[PDB]
């Protein structure tokens, strides 16, 4: 298939992997830090999603160095995914407008 759609689907798959891996690693990094709340997996998965989408309610946040590094990877995976999809959409619309005008 076309490259922009392959890249978008790839990025969605990788994003799902980053969300799951980041949830696991966030708990691993944050347990052992007194006061940390990112310490059970279901709510860590929720936190990783609202971090990837850049919503960040602030109901949960990492306090350790490694938990925050994981957060940064999650943010960047989410923003990159969303950028990839926007660009793929733009590419589709541009090509269909080229055809509709007769190139």
């Amino acid at each position, epitope marked *: 298939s076309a490259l922009h759609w392959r890249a978008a689907g790839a990025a969605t798959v990788l994003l799902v992997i980053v969300l799951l891996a980041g949830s696991y690693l966030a*708990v691993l990094a944050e*347990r052992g830090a*007194p006061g940390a709340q990112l*310490i059970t997996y279901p709510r860590a998965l929720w936190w990783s999603v609202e971090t990837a989408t850049t919503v960040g309610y602030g109901d949960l946040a990492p306090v350790t160095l490694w938990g925050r590094c994981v957060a940064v990877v999650v943010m960047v995976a989410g923003i990159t995914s969303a950028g990839l999809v926007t660009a793929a959409l733009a590419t589709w619309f541009v090509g269909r407008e080229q055809e509709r005008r007769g190139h």
Partner: antibody
Amino acid sequence: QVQLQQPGAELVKPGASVKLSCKASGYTFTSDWIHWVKQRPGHGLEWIGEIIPSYGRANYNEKIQKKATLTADKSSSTAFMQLSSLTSEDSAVYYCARERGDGYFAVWGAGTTVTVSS
Amino acid sequence: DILLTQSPAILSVSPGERVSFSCRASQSIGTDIHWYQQRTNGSPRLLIKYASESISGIPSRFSGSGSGTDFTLSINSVESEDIANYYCQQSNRWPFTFGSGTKLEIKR
């Protein structure tokens, strides 16, 4: 099928050390944590520490003097707690417990009664 | 660290009455409180998770309520086998902590 198997008793000379075991069966996940809880006779439950066998990382109760070292053998599904240089204040039942990463102790071992005496 | 206060330490009831155990957290912890029963020479047994959620195999006369800082374990119509110590435990912040326990005693 007992999910967590612990020896009934350990006798330890004052100053000596002992390795408690906790053999796990049943469903095992990468999100499992094994916890260790100390109970002095007639007293409450004191959290000692935890280990995630899928990764080998262990954390310890900071409020108490560190007498424990937690390890886990993934091939024999066994968690260990090495207690070192014990005194009579270390005489207690020590439980292991399995937490599926969601915060509560779904199942407990039967406890190992450790007596520190000569 | 989250301090969990269980008071009173001893509860005295009559057979078949409703009993309520109190557990108070030193700061707000949502519903992240779990309740265990420990009989004489027995190991603890989970009764209620996340403040109010049932556990399979636990009699239905056990229930829990509350959120924030104030939690209650309830027994509808207590009977002899409920004689035990009862502990709450929080999982909202590291480290997990336990309350100091309430003993149930029955006046027969």
